[PDB]
Amino acid sequence: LPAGSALLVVKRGPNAGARFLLDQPTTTAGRHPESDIFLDDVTVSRRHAEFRINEGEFEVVDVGSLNGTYVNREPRNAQVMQTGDEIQIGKFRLVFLAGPA
């Protein structure tokens, strides 16, 4: 992992094994075709969550999803993520891993 970045790895879901680099201030996650992290399932809202970098601090922010964004099984409006945290969006379960400072 490049310095200052982080990674999300899909552990459960139709694209299990897939993984996405977080290396910009805002990364969108949803079913909208232009989502940075495109999670294509009915359980996922068009705009579901955003992952922010502020600053050396990675945060997930639920942006008004229908069925919630879960961090370690608990729904959150916003939550600063720590390595090994499981993020659930619809049926997709991902794990967060921080890169170098």
Side-chain angles (χ1 to χ4, degrees):
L1 305 174
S5 63
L7 190 74
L8 286 164
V9 180
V10 181
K11 306 203 300 183
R12 201 204 73 188
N15 59 349
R19 52 204 74 199
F20 306 88
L21 195 59
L22 301 175
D23 191 21
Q24 64 198 38
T26 304
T27 302
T28 52
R31 194 173 38 111
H32 194 282
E34 302 302 326
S35 303
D36 294 328
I37 301 180
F38 174 64
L39 304 173
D40 189 9
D41 196 82
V42 55
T43 58
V44 177
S45 288
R46 189 169 178 71
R47 306 301 195 166
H48 195 118
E50 298 188 342
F51 296 95
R52 309 193 300 159
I53 299 184
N54 301 126
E55 284 285 326
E57 235 190 358
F58 297 84
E59 190 176 34
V60 63
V61 176
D62 184 281
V63 298
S65 75
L66 176 61
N67 52 25
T69 301
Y70 305 82
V71 181
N72 297 326
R73 299 160 305 283
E74 296 180 67
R76 297 291 179 216
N77 281 358
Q79 177 81 255
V80 169
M81 295 173 301
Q82 301 292 351
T83 291
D85 278 347
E86 285 172 350
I87 319 289
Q88 172 160 352
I89 289 153
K91 60 189 273 177
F92 296 90
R93 179 176 302 182
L94 310 98
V95 57
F96 171 81
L97 300 96

